[PDB]
Amino acid sequence: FMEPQSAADLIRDEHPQIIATILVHLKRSQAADILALFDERLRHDVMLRIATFGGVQPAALAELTEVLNGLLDGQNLKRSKMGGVRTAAEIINLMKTQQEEAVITAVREF
């Protein structure tokens, strides 16, 4: 239930086998989003480890879950859909003809 980059950086500071186990236990779409943000070496190592995953002990699973719970932060109401790009376009449409000329200029510039 978290943002891909935050979870990626969170599990990045872990052993690659632990990363692979978590990604297997995570959602497929979320794991794919997380793996796309990893470096090539770490991504290759994780893909190799997932291809040879043999199961984890229940005690190790419980300890991993407890550690992940401890590492949690104030994730309540994580992220927020307010606006962007589309709102910028709406604001540009509400700005003068000369102002939208300046807009074409700066946007091409960036």
């Binding site: 935050s6 950086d9 932060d73």
Partner: protein, 51 residues
């Protein structure tokens, strides 16, 4: 060796190494790294400069 005195001049005082202060700085760096990661939701990198 003999030099003229200037009231607007001052010298240094050798070296005053504080290993305990450096250890405290490293511990504070660890704690602050944890706190900043908790706050900004991103992993920071804190390097302790020379005292």
């Amino acid at each position: 060796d003999i030099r003229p005195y200037d009231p607007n001049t001052q010298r240094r005082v050798v070296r005053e190494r504080l290993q305990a202060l450096e250890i405290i700085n490293e511990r504070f760096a660890r704690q602050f790294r944890m706190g900043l990661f908790n706050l900004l939701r991103r992993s920071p990198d804190i390097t302790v400069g020379a005292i």
